[PDB]
Amino acid sequence: SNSIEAKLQEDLRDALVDYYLGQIVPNSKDFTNLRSTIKNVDDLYDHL
Amino acid sequence: PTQQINKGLGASNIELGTVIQRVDPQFSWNTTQEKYNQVLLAYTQLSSEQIALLSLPDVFTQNFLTQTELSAGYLSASTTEIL
């Protein structure tokens, strides 16, 4: 079933999340000053 | 890429190693080591890229040291009492 792959996309969520915390936080030329945003949910509001 | 293939063959209920051995022209048991090693590496179900991390040599040593501490007297643990 597609359910089988339906995990992958959560993995992709995690990937994005780390790309935020790992790359964006130190590499955000945007938002370079502002921090907080510790949790995934945050940008779902702030820019998503 | 890997994950996908892995789970797809999971749904296939058979393995990439299985497929490689079936696709070998010869009878696999008769084939070469360069097949045997390769196929087992397949049967690992593993990223090779992670293996890069797993296999690149050490950043550190067993112990970093300095002339300052050495002159201040290095000390190793008592260690023969281990096996």
- SS3 string, chain A, reads CHHHHHHHHHHHHHHHHHHHHHHHHHHCCCCCCCCCCCCCHHHHHHCC
**Contact (CB, 8 A) for B9 and B15:** yes
Q: Which residue of B has its CA nearest to A1?
A: B11
**Interface subset of B 3-22, CB within 8 angstroms of A:** 3-4, 7-8, 10-11
Interchain CB distance below 8 Å, B10 and A7: no
* Beta carbons of B62 and B35 less than 8 angstroms apart: no
Q: How far is residue A11 CA from its own chain's centroid?
A: 11
Looking at residue B28, the DSSP 8-state letter turns out to be: G
Q: Are B38 and A32 in contact (CB under 8 A)?
A: no
Taking alpha carbons only, the member of B19, B10, B67, B25 closest to residue A5 is B10
Select the residue of B4, B10, B11 nearest A8 (Cβ to Cβ).
B4
**Cα–Cα distance measured from residue B6 to residue B3, given in angstroms and rounded to the nearest whole number:** 5
* CA–CA gap between residue A8 and residue B4 (Å, rounded): 8
Q: Return all residues near B31 (Cβ < 8 A) that are at least 6 apart.
A: B24
Are A7 and B7 in contact (CB < 8 Å)? yes
Cβ-Cβ contacts under 8 Å for A43 (sequence gap 6 or more): A20, A37
Resolution as reported, in Å: 6.4
Q: For residue A16, count other CB atoms closer than 10 A to its CB.
A: 14
Contacts of B50 (CB under 8 A, 6+ apart): none
- Two structure tokens written together for A32: 């370079």
Q: Which of A2, A3, A4 to mutate to test the interface with B (most CBs of B within 10 A)?
A: A4
